[PDB]
Design a protein around this ligand. Structure first.
Ligand SMILES: COCCOc1ccc2cc1OCC(=O)N(C)CCCNCc1c[nH]c3ncnc(c13)N2
Length: 329
């Protein structure tokens, strides 16, 4: 009941350890350390009248749906009938009031000097500015940035299997559609577990990890429901979203609109299949692997992912894919 200073979420040592790891129009993301453990901090300026990164700031009401979705998906990790850890874990959410911390400005500058930013330097906010600060588990590095960094198509298959299981569990539990699962929104980090665990409608199984754990992020466009109350981003009046070019990503927006007849409140889990198909297309055409497929077992994996690419679009949901596709048997 009432906003807190930045110091409540980001005391001095946590601020001193912030390094920027990502950005977009409606968010800056920093990695920091709490109790010897990496965490990701997303910060969003809200409720103010000033343009930020070329756009108006979100109101609390416009951003709340995305926070609700975050929480619901995170909670799946502690469920029973429909359990997955494949969505980014949400540790805390605060509403903060203050000027941007100078230590954060220093981390912002460093990223701008080294990687380059499309954002405004966040130095013009006044001491009445509101922010939402979200603390997430640290999810690693996105698939796009790992384009040339994965061992083999065995790794690609673990990723696709993880993604398919996480989405199926979310379909089953929450009638979830991600709706924007481009390869910037698939995060990869090292795990020492050989096998990862999920439960889909009460039936548990495992996925060989190939040394990686996948986390799904960014619910800008996502949709889910509980007890008939639907949380979604109504893009029926957006034009720009559907006129992009130069990447299959931009056809996927058009194909979702075709599937749902521009009715974004409806549940069309085929959109998850569309995204998984885009991801499979990236694995086969844009990713490049350290070790190519040279042994029997490896060539078979390659042929199976190829077969997944040309067949998966005849399945109706991630649930259907996980339970019926030969790639996962
Ligand atoms: C309302 O909030 C809903 C939750 O959405 C997000 C949760 C966590 C996120 C990013 C989320 O949305 C997209 C966004 O804000 N970007 C700035 C673009 C992508 C940046 N990722 C960078 C990244 C690298 N390692 C990470 N480990 C954990 N979380 C991360 C990242 N990002």
């Amino acid at each position: 009941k009432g906003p807190v200073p930045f110091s409540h979420c980001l005391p001095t040592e946590k601020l001193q350890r912030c390094e920027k790891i990502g950005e977009g129009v409606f968010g800056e993301v920093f990695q920091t350390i709490a109790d010897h453990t990496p965490v990701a901090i997303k910060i969003i300026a809200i409720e103010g009248p000033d343009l930020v990164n070329g756009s108006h700031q979100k109101t609390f009401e416009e951003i709340l749906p995305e926070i609700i979705i975050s929480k619901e998906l995170s909670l799946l990790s502690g469920e029973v009938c429909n359990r997955t850890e494949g969505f980014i874990g949400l540790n805390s959410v605060h509403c903060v009031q203050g000027s941007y911390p100078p230590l954060l400005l220093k981390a912002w500058d460093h990223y701008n000097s080294t990687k380059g930013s499309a954002n405004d330097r966040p130095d013009f906010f006044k001491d009445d500015q509101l922010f939402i600060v979200l603390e997430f588990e640290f999810g690693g590095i996105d698939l796009e940035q790992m384009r040339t960094k994965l061992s083999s198509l065995a790794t690609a298959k673990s990723i696709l299997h993880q993604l398919t299981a996480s989405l199926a569990v979310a379909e089953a539990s929450l009638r979830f559609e991600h709706r924007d699962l481009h390869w910037g929104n698939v995060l990869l980090k090292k795990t020492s577990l050989k096998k990862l665990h999920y439960t889909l409608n009460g039936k548990s199984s495992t996925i060989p990890s190939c040394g990686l754990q996948v986390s799904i992020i960014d619910y800008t466009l996502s949709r889910l429901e509980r007890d008939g109350i639907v949380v979604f981003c109504d893009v029926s009046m957006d034009e720009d979203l559907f006129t992009g070019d130069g990447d299959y990503q931009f056809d996927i927006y058009r194909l979702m609109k075709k599937e749902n007849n521009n009715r974004w409140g409806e549940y069309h889990p085929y959109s998850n299949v569309l995204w998984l198909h885009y991801l499979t297309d990236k694995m086969l055409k844009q990713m490049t692997f350290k070790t190519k497929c040279n042994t029997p077992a490896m060539k078979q994996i390659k042929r199976k992912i190829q077969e997944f690419h040309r067949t998966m679009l005849n399945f109706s949901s991630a649930t259907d894919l996980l339970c019926q596709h030969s790639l996962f048997k």
